[model samples]
Target chain A: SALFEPYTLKDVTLRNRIAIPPMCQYMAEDGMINDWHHVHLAGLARGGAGLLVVEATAVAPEGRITPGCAGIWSDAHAQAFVPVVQAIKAAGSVPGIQIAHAGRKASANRPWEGDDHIAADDTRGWETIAPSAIAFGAHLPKVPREMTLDDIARVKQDFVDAARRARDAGFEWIELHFAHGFLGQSFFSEHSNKRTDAYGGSFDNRSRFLLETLAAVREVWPENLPLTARFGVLEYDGRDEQTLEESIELARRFKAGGLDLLSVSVGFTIPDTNIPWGPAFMGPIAERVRREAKLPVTSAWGFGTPQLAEAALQANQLDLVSVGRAHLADPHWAYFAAKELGVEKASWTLPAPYAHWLER
Target chain B: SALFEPYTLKDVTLRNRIAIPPMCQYMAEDGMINDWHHVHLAGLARGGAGLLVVEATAVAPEGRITPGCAGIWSDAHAQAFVPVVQAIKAAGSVPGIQIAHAGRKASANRPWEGDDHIAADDTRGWETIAPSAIAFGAHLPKVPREMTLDDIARVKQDFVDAARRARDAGFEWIELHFAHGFLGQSFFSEHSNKRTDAYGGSFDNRSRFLLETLAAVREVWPENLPLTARFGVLEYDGRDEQTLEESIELARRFKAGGLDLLSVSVGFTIPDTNIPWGPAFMGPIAERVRREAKLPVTSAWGFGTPQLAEAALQANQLDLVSVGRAHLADPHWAYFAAKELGVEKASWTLPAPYAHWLER
Candidate 1:
């Protein structure tokens, strides 16, 4: 039992599906990734992760979570991502990026060391704007200035620019990070929002921001390539939270506006620890949405072991299982899994020195 | 007048005394700090070192480099530290770490990161046996086996612990770590040890194991700290590394195991080209240590606002003039001493916020 099970979408056939979920590197300088990025990411590409996602990239420099998060608001930003996209493709993995405006969470420090808000005196730290002056809360609290129509317009334009960049960067897939506690998530929540503008009020009005942001991005993104959105169905617990039904409806709406797949995540409120782990990992959230909407989805948390991943896919419970720390310990998790499970054999790829030390 | 202002020890004080010293958060998984470490130290610590040191660390599992760096033998293999110490601390300023077995790195990961390294088997994580052979490293490297009489007695007691741990942690304070590494350094080396056989090296050899370990630590710990080992003159590094010059006999040697005072640190290795801040952060280093050394012989390196620091103690050049990055940022060099010449109070102490917003 191995995790190399392949699945299909409309016209494209995925190679053995082992998705590498989106991770946040927060390794940019002024929202720009440099050569260090190439070195940092190229290894993941080589790892044979079927899907290679470019972490939680920002749609615009200011919309970033920190000064270092990647962005694509400018043509120059799009150009910067080209090599990354190309490199991932060469490694036999599908290249993609999760684009979004981090909203209130913008203007924070990189998690590299100090994990909090960056002071204005910092290299280029600046003010951030969000739904209200509310904060997501932490050592780095931010009193976001409410966004006006112009702010909304700029954020939408940023995403559209990012989609354009993804294409130019040679990406065949894209995912909008509408979950977490970012801009899009704020629009999706009732607890976090009390606005009465056209961008708020009822579900239709509340969803307008995300809907509009999606339409703008989709317009520039290609029709042939699959467009995805990673959404948190339960950011505020039951009551006001989007139920599975509401989530499916939202996914349908996203599809109508051009999204191709749904990647389910929970807890925009605070990293959905309640989502649980193990065999189910994402369990019902993504699988339920997929079953209800008849859509494709990807999930990750702790599907670390190979046996569990295989069973999940073979049973149609999951299409992909993403691994984070497991991979760090052993880059060849996939290769090793195949060998251990007695699945089809591939080259016993190993770090030459590593192989020599362990095997020799 | 300034931070670099003269500091006096027992009897000797240097020109503008200052020191740059210890700060350690070992981040090596499976043992041993890696590339991330190079970045941590090289750029800032090394560039400006007066008496730069490494981190407080270990000589073995019992004397951990933080459940991070490997040590003197086997898993705590001391040899590996040779290159790092020689290259950074030894050649530059003075390199050192507290060098305790960690007793525990964290009952988990690092304090800043998280708590605990999870494993399926609880008993399987750490097998910390003092003098035991529990093979410790990152990722289930193996449990450490316990120590025997040979491990304790003949192994070189505390001196080897101080010497080797000092060598590995990479600092000049060399606090013996005897408090920590001294045990392991003494366990492995052959100076003033506490054993009972020819292999104990001698009876004096046994005592000498610890003593010589201290001396060896001192030899490499640097002429700084006076390479002060944290014990009374009758104890380890203090007794061993203390000078033998006639006349004043100028010894920073063991002044008394439980001395009235013990030297502390200034900052990390400043002499390294990697530490761009300049070497003068040592002003604080010397400031903290001189008070404890209690001997008139002490001073750190680099340059601060030399004049201000110098003029502070009237008629005598401040023990040492230490300067680091912040000093370079200011155009007014030697301005620390300018205050002595009736300069205004607008110089060093007041921060930008107070001066710009409050005072103005």
Candidate 2:
């Protein structure tokens, strides 16, 4: 089955098609990862995912989505990841990290913690920055400060520094976070970026920040390693056609900028937009982006089912199936997927300690 | 059918017979819990366990089984539990904590991290105290320091103080950890306790530490709240019959000393004993203790299956079923158990957010 087949990208080869997409755990302390992340990532890596991407980590302090978001703003913060990265490699999973800036979506409470923007009066809240001074609206109504050219230069350098730190920490794959209504995504969306500066107000200007960040990150990030980006290809806000056209163009530019793969996703730019949430809902959209840009891609939002993952791969909708929430439910979902797809010795996908006990 | 029944002990009423037993996560930091424990306990509470007993928490720093063990040795450490207790209560599950001292088992590496006694040369290793200066042998080769009369008095005080702090932290129920061949269990088992003092030798002397700690804690733990203890009632050694006789007498003493319920378990006192490990194997032994001592009792190990838990309850073998490892696999096991037992609105066993989505 395609789900059990190995895939090679650049110098890395995944044992299977399963990819654990970055999922926020909200368990860090002062931006330092702890035993929770160690156990979570290591255990998931032992579950046989081809690639284990760390959650969307903040490039700078104020760029964090929540107080609990993971960050790589300093050397000390990056050093905390060494043991976790080694543990993942020991478990046969390539370690990857998503460098992100939440932009207008920054400084919000965790999903379970009311999922709203922190009040200005809250001592824990910090001022957020974006391409333009605009509020995301709804639960996130805090208007962010518009980024000057200097702020843009600084954040882009933050991305470069984070990528270098990730490389030093021995990460095999690096993901530039450009989706989920975060800083990079906000720069691309017309609704969020209303500035008349060179970074906004036009298609080329909208694509500029993402393209520049990718190029800057490329210099420090190894050329032999897979460079990936998660992109919001469409808004599903009645501008679906135009958004896809622009996002596809962005993907082509990303490919030309040395991106190995694109994780296709919806632009969570506005809360009012209707999301057709269901199993494998992103497959068709990801396929469109993949075909138009001639780039390999992966996507999440429910490809957790084995048959669905297999069908997506068979239909050439995705180069890799990114399963998020399902991995949280069962870290050994790869073993389950292997079994469902009739792979021999499915239990062997797990570490020997678990495999020997689980083998019937 | 009987698994869904509510159980009341003292002032605490469990919504169902399902109880999540104490299972070590080995993720604490110098005895203080952080987000790891908060999410773990809160998530389990939301999964519909009638009672969630936290893993064995040390009363003092030296009492920890490993460097990672949870400790309530200080007010600051105890304060770490306040948010967790509030979160558990918010999820509608009774919050219970197990106060423990690892005794001879203290200062050991985590179970996965070698499961051996820490080396004396290791800076992380600490001196461990027990009823006798004896080694558990096998993986635990370090000899523990025999407790002086003052040592026993100080440890008892620690237990009392821990119970007082736990009460203030809003724990509705408390379980004295007297099992797993740790300090309290070692005192009871003749193989581990060879001291020629008040804490060892004869049955009454061997029973001294366990009884003294219980009486001390009872003063601080309110009468209305459930006062429970997990005990290793019988060792599967050659002296099983004699051990059972003495253990039952101790259970009777516990009942007379205001104990609400006893969690029956095997004495893993020494490395040479063979335990007949299987599904629900401890039910018969727990039933024996319950019948002999005329005390309410619970026992774990393979009661994860709904029918097995139901049968145990229907047969009047146990007052409550302690399900451990199963809960680790799926925090929503109670919901799964409810569905397996054909309970109406089984999905309601989960929190609203999860229930609405999980419901067919």
Q: Whose DockQ is greatest here?
A: 2
Task: Give the Cα lDDT of each candidate.
Answer: 0.53, 0.88
Give the per-residue lDDT digits (tens) of candidate 2, residues B1-360.
Answer: 688889999889999999998877777999999756776777678778899998899999999999989999999999999988987898789999999999998999877578899988998999999888888888888888988999999999999999999999999999999999998998888888887788888889989999999999998899999999999988788888888988999999999999999999988988887899999999998889999999999999989989999999998899999988666655667887988899988877875434544455
- lDDT tens digits, residue span A254-313, model 2: 999999999999889888798889999999999998999999999988898899999999
What is residue B64's positional error in candidate 2, in angstroms? 2.3
Ten contiguous residues minimizing lDDT sum, candidate 2 chain A:
A351-360
Q: Interface RMSD in Å per candidate, to 1 decimal?
A: 18.9, 6.6
Predicted structure with the largest lDDT when compared to the true one:
2
Q: What is the TM-score of chain A in candidate 1?
A: 0.89
For model 2, what is the alpha-carbon lDDT of residue B347? 79
Model 2 CAPRI rating: incorrect
Q: Write the per-residue lDDT of candidate 1 for residues A1-360, one digit (tens) a residue.
A: 437666555444555677766766665665677654553455455545677677788877778887667777777777877776776665567777888778777888666447677776787677887766677676557667888889888888888878888888888778899887788887777656667888877888878888998888878888788888888776445443435566678878887787788777774643323444455557656677778777777777767677777776776666667766454433345655665567643432322212222231
Candidate maximizing TM-score: 2
DockQ of each: 0.01, 0.08
* Candidate 1: tens digits of C-alpha lDDT, residues B1-360: 334333443332322243433345345555555544443343222222334445554554444433444344343544445555554442233444444443212233443333344343654245443322332244323343444556545334443555545444443345444332224333332321334443354334333334544544444443434444332121123322331111012123344322222332221111111222344332443343344444422232343444544543343332433333222222122232343344454232222211222121
